């Protein structure tokens, strides 16, 4: 199970790139979010993550989908 | 034909509500954009405008679609 601290940190990093504050970011910024968390995903790993969280193909990731993906990863 | 001044003013008003600067706003803010231009559309007029510019139903209006709608209106 994710801890409160992890959820908070996932949220904070995500929100750094949510410039309009509506809880969504671009798939192009997912790598930046991950590196903001101190991680270093490969291009392949990011593509697999993008396939998971951008379920509908529109290039937009919302926080709830990001978080559950992060939970699976951990 | 729209003048340069009108295009510039349409762009500036639109961009007031493009908080992440990617050239799109929400349909919920279209009325605010119109009032920023000194206009006062009715609810019916806004709904007709929303039908025009949010052609795909996703609640997101981009500048090119806004501008051509504004051109038709004028
Ligand atoms: C990433 As978005 C839906 O706030 O343009
Ligand atoms: C109105 As938008 C696509 O920048 O969230
Ligand atoms: Mg998506
Ligand atoms: Mg749309
Ligand atoms: Na956003
Ligand atoms: Na925007
Ligand atoms: Zn947004
Ligand atoms: Zn979602
Ligand atoms: Zn945006
Ligand atoms: Zn468009």
Swiss-Prot record, chains A, B:
Cellular location of this protein? Cytoplasm, Cytoskeleton, Spindle; Cytoplasm, Cytoskeleton, Spindle pole; Cytoplasm, Cytoskeleton, Microtubule organizing center, Centrosome; Cell projection, Cilium, Flagellum
Domain EF-hand per the UniProt entry, residue ranges: 5-40, 41-74
What post-translational modification information does the record give? Ubiquitination results in a strongly decreased activity.
User: Which superkingdom, per the lineage?
Assistant: Eukaryota
Sequence positions that bind Ca(2+) 2: 54, 56, 58, 60, 65
**Covalent cross-link Glycyl lysine isopeptide (Lys-Gly) (interchain with G-Cter in ubiquitin) as placed by the record, residue numbers:** 19
List ligand-binding residues for Ca(2+) 1.
Answer: 18, 20, 22, 24, 29
> Residues where N6-acetyllysine occurs?
19
Assembly and binders: Homotetramer. Interacts with MYO1C, MYO5A and RRAD. Interacts with MYO10. Interacts with CEP97, CCP110, TTN/titin and SRY. Interacts with USP6; the interaction is calcium dependent. Interacts with CDK5RAP2. Interacts with SCN5A. Interacts with RYR1. Interacts with FCHO1. Interacts with MIP in a 1:2 stoichiometry; the interaction with the cytoplasmic domains from two MIP subunits promotes MIP water channel closure. Interacts with ORAI1; this may play a role in the regulation of ORAI1-mediated calcium transport. Interacts with IQCF1. Interacts with SYT7. (Microbial infection) Interacts with Rubella virus protease/methyltransferase p150.
Q: Which disease is it linked to?
A: Ventricular tachycardia, catecholaminergic polymorphic, 4: An arrhythmogenic disorder characterized by stress-induced, bidirectional ventricular tachycardia that may degenerate into cardiac arrest and cause sudden death. Patients present with recurrent syncope, seizures, or sudden death after physical activity or emotional stress. CPVT4 inheritance is autosomal dominant.
The UniProt similarity line reads: Belongs to the calmodulin family.
Q: What else is known?
A: This protein has four functional calcium-binding sites.
Q: Please state what the annotation says regarding this protein's domains.
A: The N-terminal and C-terminal lobes of CALM bind to the C-terminus of KCNQ1 in a clamp-like conformation. Binding of CALM C-terminus to KCNQ1 is calcium-independent but is essential for assembly of the structure. Binding of CALM N-terminus to KCNQ1 is calcium-dependent and regulates electrophysiological activity of the channel. The C-lobe interacts with KCNN4 channels in a calcium-independent manner, whereas the N-lobe interacts with the S4-S5 linker of KCNN4 in a calcium-dependent manner playing a role as calcium sensor and gating the channel.
Q: What does this protein do?
A: Calmodulin acts as part of a calcium signal transduction pathway by mediating the control of a large number of enzymes, ion channels, aquaporins and other proteins through calcium-binding. Calcium-binding is required for the activation of calmodulin. Among the enzymes to be stimulated by the calmodulin-calcium complex are a number of protein kinases, such as myosin light-chain kinases and calmodulin-dependent protein kinase type II (CaMK2), and phosphatases.
Its protein name is: Calmodulin-1
Which lineage?
A: Eukaryota, Metazoa, Chordata, Craniata, Vertebrata
Residues of the whole record sequence present: 4 to 77 of 149
């Amino acid at each position: 199970q994710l801890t409160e601290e992890q959820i908070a940190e996932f949220k904070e990093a995500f929100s750094l790139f949510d410039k309009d504050g509506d809880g969504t970011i671009t798939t192009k910024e997912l790598g930046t979010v991950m590196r903001s968390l101190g991680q270093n995903p490969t291009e392949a790993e990011l593509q697999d993550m993008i396939n998971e969280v951008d379920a509908d193909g529109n290039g937009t990731i919302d926080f709830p989908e990001f978080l559950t993906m992060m939970a699976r990863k951990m």
